[PDB]
């Protein structure tokens, strides 16, 4: 692109980083002030306004304005300190900002598709100006993590998720498309909000809903190819599982709430085995919660146990799950298809405390967002049953965590192995023992998986890919980090971690004949590195060249040399 | 335009005001949330965020973001209460905001042309994407009214001035181009500012400067036509006069600081004559100040006196001017070409107070921005010399006014006729007398003059046009307003006032054979009204039609009817 | 964005000329550019055909068709498919070469890419000159061996243009996805080198590593931009180069050479059809080849493959083949052999003439491809008719003037018992006794359109020789029993579209069976799949996808100042 429109193109606009020579060649000289900045200086300038904002919501606003106008500089900001900006452009800030301010994007970021557009989704996809789309993140806004039904304001979530695709993994942002499917909302505050801009009716459900999703998957792959990655985000429990099972073997599709959480949780368990120094087959798991994340984790745990030689039915019996009605047991009321798979042969048990005492688990995993569910008695019981009990308080936000890191370490007398979904600072007990608890962040998983899937044209994503990703993450943890109680690698290394995951995923796919891209690269690291997006500005070179002087003389015909021999 | 780019086009983008039918016809359905708002509702929504801003600077910022994305809605805001938003998008806020924040435009608003681009201005004009430009506002940022040398940050001033062209007069904003000429800056704070984005050297001056201005006028009229209006804004004293005299008879050009201020000041004097009930020839004027505004006013006053039958040399002697060195008298030191024209045959006089006592003027006009120059003694002297003395404290801002309205009315015992450049609230004296002092706003003049000049292709703008504009403004004042002491019509009627001025200017031009547009319209009001820009959204109609059925049948040839007779 | 405005009239894929309806002209914004008559495509065809039949020569008919293809692609293929047997010799062999030799390149719209040896290192940049991004088939030549004519240098661009016309007209391959390329490395044609009007490179042909490097870069650049699945067909290369490039690329790219592999498959198809007359097996036959070039090697290798399929050991199969080059019979120990010729060397004394080889070997089939006129002498034909009841006489050399013998001479000398086929079309033959024969033509168009259609439809990554053998078996079954009784070995060219479809399906079945097809999911109904991809001369629609939402839903989504609360 050239001319005035390049300044309005977020992928190409450099602002004052355009050199004079670049402005003249593009035909834009005069549109930009007479100063030529480096991107380092641009980062300096924008960070001054970023730090002046009084709240995380206002910092998200500033960043979205920057993404609107200069994508490269936006990712220079994000990659300058990914741990600092990840909670601003994504969870938990993105949902809070969209809940409060609505959609602040002043440049269209993706597609809003409604139930009333049924039968015309193919035409709507043609509104997006990029034809080479390789990854889609879609939501219906019904189950925004930690907030619930945000309806059409849920569009902020795929936009923020895709920013982590690029910032943490290096996925080309220009090949990425966020989509909000608006079928209504059951949030009464939104339905009665004069300023709400989504469909003001209750959510369409049943097969009419499923038909819209079917046409969406068909239209996206008709236009962008069957290889296009489609990641589902923040769907409700029942819908999430039905859609995953319906599409995962027909399309290039996964659900990060089910399968990404599974991979990062199992990665923490695998790293804890390096401390407990026992086999996975010796463990007994109690789950606090039975939703999308809990089922995904339990399913991936069973697969990990099978890898160690434990038969499936025997592996399943090592898993005990507690929902809001109590222990999930055979013949109990209020069960569904997924819950029946882990139903134990045991009488009803009402409380998690009693389940812990009856089962005596080696590991407890909470994802139910019930604050304080890991009571002092539970922590005491576990520390008495086993030398090094594993305590995973994975619920978000911090106010809904099953316990704090400090309570776990204090009550277990420094022997509990802890991980959380929320960031906890270092803990120093009274006797001097220091712990650095890790955070089970989904960003350890989906950037590298997406990068490898996109790089190789991986047709479908079996759960073995999420299991090998968990295994790669667990080995990123150094021996010194383990001695500090850290079960996850530093988030500051996420781009290197995602790159190594992408390579392992790509290698797995070629060996299983799942990759569509050919020829198979001999050097997979070099191949994937060549697709990693950098915040560095590109260069508009002209690729000028000449022919040899003798060639140009004989090929240039004039009246003087027309009859030369 | 159609497709995704219409959402990025400020002139065509309606945002959520696009109906579903419009989105489908433009091929943008899906890029916009599934709600269809009226412009009234859009105005409601944006005004909520506008009123939440804590300062005028922040309100200017919000408005510039809106102008960046939706020009029609921007002018709906401005025209909703023009008196409220004029001081935000223009003086005094625009200069303060640009001084503090720099240039906040995230969409290019015009052209930055530097002295180092000499010889290539024609190429730079091709960077602007609009080919049909009919009005240019240019500055070099040296004398921003009330602030001084803002260098390249002066670009905000032509951008804000053009907003008043459109909001107050109805000039088509798409045909308007703001230009900043950067020749350097002598503001030491800017030269040492790490964040300053203009040329970091002192101002180029002399003929090298004049050569750049010559090439600018040549390039603009070469590309857009010799009829293109070029308005000079916020140039320094000497440059402003030299450039006006050099270009006003060669191009379609005026300087609003010299000639616009002149017209609005004379309009106030003419309206005061309706109260003093005497002839202009009976007046004696003392000027506090001798810069651009003072000279423009004095020159237009002489022309008004000539119209009443007073010969020029005799008319000039009714004008006494005081600069910072004292009364301008023949043979005095520190005089220039303009000052010598009004030099009186009198010994040197140091102070304005003594000049008032020696001259006993009927009217005093201050534009020198010296606070309190109209002392209690001056006001007392004038009220003793004449029944209804005219007191024009025209300097900006309020803190630099020669006196307040209340001081004028109190000291003159309610007999002084007052106007100011700054807004003063109503004044009620102790004896019950109430006054509503008017503000001599330049926006009474340049919108209507520009609208008439553009509508008619008026080749040059003689000062008679500014004199007839003053006469039109003075007659807009109602008899009831005069009894309240108001010398100017309400600013809420500015669009109607500008329209009547444009018609009178257009009529003058055709009678003097100055208008280029032909044929001469018989109904000039209807003609000008047809060019007035409204904040109303336009409509993308398809203009579909059919031929008569018999025509379509005979003109449609098939194998079946090929040989019909 | 769908193409609109004046440019659609210059778009050969979309321009309909006067077949644009009034509704379409207004929708596209082109009304006024076209005369005021609305023609059906049938009437357009009638109009162009009257001008076509008025041309006095095949060369002039070619020029008329080329100016039509320049302006209206759909009407062009309406003409071609109205009688493909009539127009095939006009747009391709033999007319295309004679036309380009005489007139040069008459295209007035750019048809493809001229890439020269002097452009080495910049081929990726040159591909970006072609305005179509979605290319699925490339036909490339260096013009060295135009069939029947020799070295035409850069005038050889006509051959890929004409070849691709047959892809679409004969097979139904989408023409918009097709790209012809001329590689200019010079020419050894002395008439072109001394012609002041020649527009190619004016030097002898560059050979050696620089030539090979250019071809390597061409294959890399084409597949880098359009994908590794892009079909690349080599045409009219010199014999040594053609074989060497085929072996280098056929397992790395989706590539084949029609002069070698297409000729082999159609020749074997004729032999297999002759078996339905001789009513014996392929292993009962003994082949003598007049000519030992690479086209003869192509036929010989495919024959050995067909013999192995019958169960003949490879060594036994190869000994059924006797080849005669310019030096005589290829025997063991003979001088002037080469690597490929020694594979078919027989343990036999040296024999100088083809006539003596025929008498000593007594072949059941003789195949001439050496382009030696009259090589099948009366003695050879008389001997064949006395050795076997129904000898096979294949005079496949081109052009007609260099055929080994005419159809009349074969039928007369063999007393009506010889089974004849040629590469040139011979008319019907009636001997003096009344016996009538209809000799068939071994046209490469029986092969490459269906192969290309199936390869492109399935994303078949490489084209093994098994595909050309099964294509030959399909063609041999197409001939009716009645046509065999008349001496016809090939199906009527008027059925080529149906034959091509059946070949494409068989190729697709084979590819999915052996994991060669990259398109997924594998279609259950291969016939319906391919039919959906076949291009038709029917003009495409411009129906706008407009619709409304339910009335109540749209009312709730429509927000005004009145219904805001």
Here the tokens at position B335 are: 């005089």
Considering the domain architecture, whether residues A376 and A417 belong to the same structural domain is answered as yes
The alpha carbon of residue A421 and the mean position of all alpha carbons in its chain are separated, in whole angstroms, by: 14
Rounded to an integer, what distance in angstroms lies between the CA atom of residue B513 and that of residue B521? 14
The answer for residues whose C-beta is within 8 angstroms of residue B135's C-beta and 6 or more apart is B162, B165, B171, B175, B176, B177, B228, B229, B230, B231, B450, B454
Domain boundary among A481, A503, A525: A503
Rounded to an integer, what distance in angstroms lies between the CA atom of residue C374 and that of residue C396? 12
Considering the domain architecture, whether residues B339 and B210 belong to the same structural domain is answered as no
- Phi and psi angles of residue B381, each rounded to the nearest 5 degrees, phi first: -60, -45
Find the helix or strand (DSSP H, E) in which B103 lies: none
Rounded to an integer, what distance in angstroms lies between the CA atom of residue B15 and that of residue B18? 6
Considering the domain architecture, whether residues B252 and B398 belong to the same structural domain is answered as no
Rounded to an integer, what distance in angstroms lies between the CA atom of residue B469 and that of residue B452? 11
Resolution to 1 decimal place, in Å: 1.9
Considering the domain architecture, whether residues B277 and B244 belong to the same structural domain is answered as no
Say yes or no for a CB contact (<8 Å) between A459 and C565: no
**Do residues A324 and A296 lie in contact, with contact meaning Cβ atoms separated by under 8 Å?**
no
Considering the domain architecture, whether residues A42 and A183 belong to the same structural domain is answered as yes
**Interstrand relation of B319-323 and B229-232 (parallel, antiparallel or unpaired):** unpaired
Domain boundary among A258, A291, A314: A258
Say yes or no for a CB contact (<8 Å) between A30 and B5: no
**Do residues B500 and B472 lie in contact, with contact meaning Cβ atoms separated by under 8 Å?**
yes
Residue B533 lies in a domain: no
Rounded to an integer, what distance in angstroms lies between the CA atom of residue B185 and that of residue A35? 14
Residue A552 lies in a domain: no
**Do residues B198 and B152 lie in contact, with contact meaning Cβ atoms separated by under 8 Å?**
yes
Considering the domain architecture, whether residues A268 and A193 belong to the same structural domain is answered as no
Find the helix or strand (DSSP H, E) in which C528 lies: helix C526-531
Instruction: Determine contact: B324 vs chain C, CB below 8 A.
Output: no
Rounded to an integer, what distance in angstroms lies between the CA atom of residue A250 and that of residue B38? 43
Compute how many other C-beta atoms are within 10 angstroms of the C-beta atom of residue C144.
23
**Do residues C170 and C449 lie in contact, with contact meaning Cβ atoms separated by under 8 Å?**
yes
* Tokens 């506008």 found at: B50
By C-alpha distance, which of A52, A42, A160, A180 is closest to A111? A180
Considering the domain architecture, whether residues B422 and B318 belong to the same structural domain is answered as yes
Across the interface, of B41, B546, B552, the residue whose CB is closest to C561 is B41
Is the preceding omega at residue C260 within 30 degrees of 0, hence cis? no
- Give C12→chain A minimum CA distance, Å: 23
The answer for residues whose C-beta is within 8 angstroms of residue B479's C-beta and 6 or more apart is none
Rounded to an integer, what distance in angstroms lies between the CA atom of residue C96 and that of residue A148? 70
Residue A561 lies in a domain: no
Rounded to an integer, what distance in angstroms lies between the CA atom of residue A171 and that of residue B459? 58
Rounded to an integer, what distance in angstroms lies between the CA atom of residue C210 and that of residue C106? 30
Q: Which residue of B has its CA nearest to C557?
A: B35
> What is the residue-wise DSSP string for B469-481?
HHHHHHHHS-HHH
Q: Which of residues 344-383 of C touch B (CB under 8 A)?
A: none
Compute how many other C-beta atoms are within 10 angstroms of the C-beta atom of residue C306.
19
Rounded to an integer, what distance in angstroms lies between the CA atom of residue B108 and that of residue B75? 18
By C-alpha distance, which of B71, B72, B52 is closest to B62? B52
Across the interface, of A199, A519, A557, the residue whose CB is closest to C557 is A199
* Cβ burial, residue C68 (10 Å; 0-12/13-18/19+): buried
User: Does the annotation flag C145 for ligand binding?
Assistant: yes
* Tokens 């440059």 found at: B239
Domain count, chain A: 2
Say yes or no for a CB contact (<8 Å) between C518 and A519: no
Considering the domain architecture, whether residues B242 and B263 belong to the same structural domain is answered as no
Question: Helices A39-52 and A56-69: crossing angle, nearest 10°?
Answer: 150
Residues of B in contact with C39 (CB under 8 A): 557
- Phi and psi angles of residue C394, each rounded to the nearest 5 degrees, phi first: -110, 100
Considering the domain architecture, whether residues B38 and B62 belong to the same structural domain is answered as yes
Q: Which of residues 526-545 of B touch C (CB under 8 A)?
A: 542-545
* A113: β partners: A181
A5 DSSP assignment:
G
Q: Which of B90, B247, B251, B488 is catalytic?
A: B90
**Do residues C489 and C501 lie in contact, with contact meaning Cβ atoms separated by under 8 Å?**
no
- Give C77→chain B minimum CA distance, Å: 19
Across the interface, of A516, A551, A562, the residue whose CB is closest to C118 is A551
Edge-to-edge strands of the sheet including A135-139? A111-114, A176-182, A135-139, A229-232, A252-255
Is C565 labeled as catalytic in the residue annotation? no
Across the interface, of C2, C549, C561, the residue whose CB is closest to B38 is C561
Residue A105 lies in a domain: yes
Find the helix or strand (DSSP H, E) in which C443 lies: none
Classify the phi-psi angles of B94: left when phi > 0, otherwise alpha if psi is within -120 to 50, otherwise beta.
alpha
Residue A127 lies in a domain: yes
Considering the domain architecture, whether residues A192 and A283 belong to the same structural domain is answered as no
Considering the domain architecture, whether residues B415 and B403 belong to the same structural domain is answered as yes
CATH code, C88: 3.40.50.10380
**Residues of A carrying an active site annotation:** 90, 161
Instruction: Determine contact: B550 vs chain C, CB below 8 A.
Output: no
C74 DSSP assignment:
H
Residues of C in contact with A123 (CB under 8 A): 545
Instruction: Determine contact: A119 vs chain C, CB below 8 A.
Output: yes
Say yes or no for a CB contact (<8 Å) between B543 and C26: yes
CATH code, B263: 3.40.50.720
C-alpha distances in angstroms, B34 versus A127, A187, B30?
Answer: 14, 17, 8
Rounded to an integer, what distance in angstroms lies between the CA atom of residue C376 and that of residue C357? 12
**Do residues C280 and C389 lie in contact, with contact meaning Cβ atoms separated by under 8 Å?**
no
Q: Which of C92, C249, C253, C539 is catalytic?
A: C92
Compute how many other C-beta atoms are within 10 angstroms of the C-beta atom of residue B473.
26
Secondary structure in 3-state letters for A319-375: EEEEECCEECECCCCCCCHHHHHCCECCCCCCCHHHHHHHHCCCEEEECCCCCCCCC
Residue A531 lies in a domain: no
- Give B35→chain C minimum CA distance, Å: 5
Alpha-helical segments (H) within B53-120: 56-69, 71-80, 82-89, 93-101
- Phi and psi angles of residue B295, each rounded to the nearest 5 degrees, phi first: -65, -40
> What is the residue-wise DSSP string for B290-356?
-SHHHHHHHHHHHHHHHHTT--HHHHHTTEEEEETTEE-BTT-SS--HHHHHT-BSS-----HHHHH
**Do residues C421 and C268 lie in contact, with contact meaning Cβ atoms separated by under 8 Å?**
no
Rounded to an integer, what distance in angstroms lies between the CA atom of residue B65 and that of residue A215? 37
Rounded to an integer, what distance in angstroms lies between the CA atom of residue A152 and that of residue A179? 10
Structural domain span for residue A209: 15-258
**Do residues B16 and B72 lie in contact, with contact meaning Cβ atoms separated by under 8 Å?**
no
Is B90 labeled as catalytic in the residue annotation? yes
Residues of B in contact with C561 (CB under 8 A): 38, 40-41, 44
Q: Which residue of B has its CA nearest to C35?
A: B555
- Phi and psi angles of residue B320, each rounded to the nearest 5 degrees, phi first: -120, 130
C-alpha distances in angstroms, B486 versus A110, B267, B403, B483?
Answer: 55, 12, 17, 7
Method: X-ray
Considering the domain architecture, whether residues B242 and B152 belong to the same structural domain is answered as yes
Question: Helices B39-52 and B71-80: crossing angle, nearest 10°?
Answer: 70
**Interstrand relation of A326-327 and A319-323 (parallel, antiparallel or unpaired):** antiparallel
Question: Helices B292-307 and B463-476: crossing angle, nearest 10°?
Answer: 80
- Phi and psi angles of residue C324, each rounded to the nearest 5 degrees, phi first: -125, 120
Alpha-helical segments (H) within A386-523: 405-411, 446-456, 463-476, 479-483, 494-511
Residue B536 lies in a domain: no
Domain boundary among A258, A282, A301: A258
Q: Where are the beta strands (DSSP E) in C218-309?
A: 231-234, 255-257, 287-290
Alpha-helical segments (H) within B32-171: 39-52, 56-69, 71-80, 82-89, 93-101, 121-125, 156-164
Half-sphere exposure of A535 (CA within 13 A, CB side): 22
Residue B456 lies in a domain: yes
List subunits contacting chain B, requiring 3 or more Cβ pairs under 8 Å.
Answer: A, C
Question: Helices C95-103 and C58-71: crossing angle, nearest 10°?
Answer: 90
Is the preceding omega at residue A199 within 30 degrees of 0, hence cis? no
C-alpha distances in angstroms, C484 versus A208, C410, C438, C439?
Answer: 59, 17, 9, 10
Compute how many other C-beta atoms are within 10 angstroms of the C-beta atom of residue B530.
10
**Do residues B14 and B74 lie in contact, with contact meaning Cβ atoms separated by under 8 Å?**
no
């Amino acid at each position: 692109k050239r001319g005035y429109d390049v300044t309005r193109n977020p992928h190409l606009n450099k602002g004052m980083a355009f050199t004079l020579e670049e402005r003249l060649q593009l035909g834009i000289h005069g549109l930009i002030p007479p100063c030529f900045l480096s991107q380092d200086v641009q980062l300096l300038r924008i960070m001054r306004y970023y730090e002046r904002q009084q709240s995380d919501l206002d910092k998200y606003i500033i960043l979205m304005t920057l993404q609107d106008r200069n994508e490269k500089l936006f990712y220079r900001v994000l990659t300058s300190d990914v741990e600092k900006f990840m909670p601003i452009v994504y969870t938990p800030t993105v949902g809070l900002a969209c809940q409060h301010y609505g959609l602040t994007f002043r440049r269209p970021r993706g597609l809003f598709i409604t139930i009333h557009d049924k039968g015309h989704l193919a035409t709507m996809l043609n509104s997006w100006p990029e034809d080479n789309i390789k990854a889609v993140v879609v939501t219906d806004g019904e189950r925004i993590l930690g907030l619930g039904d945000l309806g059409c304001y849920g569009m902020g979530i795929p936009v923020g998720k895709l920013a982590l695709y690029t910032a943490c993994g290096g996925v080309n942002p220009q090949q990425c498309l966020p989509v909000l499917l608006d079928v209504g909302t059951n949030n009464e505050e939104l339905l009665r909000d004069p300023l709400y801009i989504g469909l003001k009716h209750q959510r369409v459900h049943g097969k009419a809903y499923d038909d819209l999703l079917d046409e969406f998957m068909q239209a996206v792959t008709d236009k962008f190819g069957i290889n296009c990655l489609i990641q589902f985000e923040d769907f409700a429990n029942a819908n999430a599982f039905r859609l995953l099972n319906k599409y995962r073997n027909k399309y290039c599709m996964f659900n990060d709430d089910i399968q990404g959480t599974a991979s990062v949780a199992v990665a923490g368990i695998l790293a804890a085995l390096r401390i407990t120094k026992n086999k996975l087959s010796n463990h007994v798991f109690v789950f606090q919660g039975a939703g999308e994340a809990a089922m995904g984790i339990a399913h991936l745990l069973v697969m990990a146990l099978e890898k160690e030689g434990v038969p499936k039915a025997e592996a399943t019996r090592k898993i005990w799950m507690v929902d809001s009605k109590g222990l999930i047991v055979k013949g109990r009321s209020h069960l569904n298809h997924e819950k029946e798979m882990f139903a134990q042969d045991h009488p009803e048990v009402n409380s998690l405390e009693e389940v812990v005492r009856l089962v005596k688990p080696t590991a407890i995993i909470g994802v139910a967002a019930i604050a304080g569910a890991f009571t002092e008695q539970i922590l005491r019981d576990m520390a008495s049953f086993h030398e090094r009990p594993i305590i995973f308080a994975l619920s978000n936000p911090t106010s809904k965590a099953e316990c704090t890191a400090e309570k776990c370490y204090r009550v277990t007398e420094g022997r509990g192995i802890f991980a959380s979904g929320s960031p906890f600072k270092s803990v120093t007990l009274e006797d001097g023992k220091t712990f650095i608890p890790g955070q089970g962040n989904n960003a350890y998983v989906f950037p590298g998986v997406a990068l490898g899937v996109i790089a190789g044209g991986i047709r479908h994503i079996p759960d073995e890919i999420f299991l090998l990703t968990a295994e790669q993450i667990a080995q990123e943890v150094s021996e010194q980090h383990l001695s500090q109680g850290r079960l996850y690698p530093p988030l500051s290394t996420i781009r290197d971690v995602s790159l190594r995951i992408a390579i392992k995923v790509l290698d797995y796919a070629y060996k299983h004949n799942l990759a569509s891209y050919y020829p198979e690269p001999k050097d997979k690291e070099a191949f994937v590195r060549s697709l990693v997006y950098t915040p560095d500005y590109d260069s508009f070179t002209l690729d000028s060249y000449t022919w040899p002087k003798e060639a140009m003389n004989v090929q240039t015909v004039t009246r003087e040399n027309l009859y030369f021999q």
